[PDB]
């Protein structure tokens, strides 16, 4: 259904 | 012009965006579909949380890699028929964009010009 994207890293 | 919109009528979105924001605070919901006529793959998923604090080009890179496309395919995106700028964030999109059912709508093409 719904997708969850990432956050960047240091 | 949108699917989710032909799918569903706004009240419909509207409770949806609603109840995603207040499940998910720090995120902004986005539709993501494909432009009028454009000649690109479809995605699996139409619906996306995004992080606030993503930036336009961390969400190019996303969702190109989402489409499966050749490196030499060119893709472009639109908010408004228009196409965003580089230095925002999906936060900034949003907060400028978003329309009354709690959703931004993102369309995205080949073409640099939206509906080409």
Redesign the interface.
């Known amino acids: 259904d719904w997708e969850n994207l990432p956050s960047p890293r240091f | 012009k949108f699917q989710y919109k032909e799918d569903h009528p706004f009240e419909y979105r509207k409770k949806e965006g609603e109840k ?1 924001r207040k499940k ?1 605070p720090d ?1 902004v919901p986005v539709i993501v579909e494909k432009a009028p006529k454009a000649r690109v793959p479809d995605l699996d ?1 139409r ?5 606030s ?2 930036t336009v080009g ?2 190019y890179f ?1 969702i190109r890699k ?1 489409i499966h496309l050749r490196p030499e395919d060119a893709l472009f995106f639109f908010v408004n028929n228009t196409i965003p700028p580089t230095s925002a964030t999906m936060g900034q999109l949003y907060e400028d964009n978003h329309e009354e059912d709690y959703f931004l709508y993102v369309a995205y093409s080949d073409e640099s010009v939206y509906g080409k």
């Open positions: 995603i998910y995120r998923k619906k996306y949380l995004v992080p604090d993503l961390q969400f996303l989402r």
